[PDB]
Amino acid sequence: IWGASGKLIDTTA
Secondary structure (H helix, E strand, C coil): CCCCCCCCCCCCC
């Protein structure tokens, strides 16, 4: 996950 993957999961890891 880098930035935003879809909508709800927004974490830089």
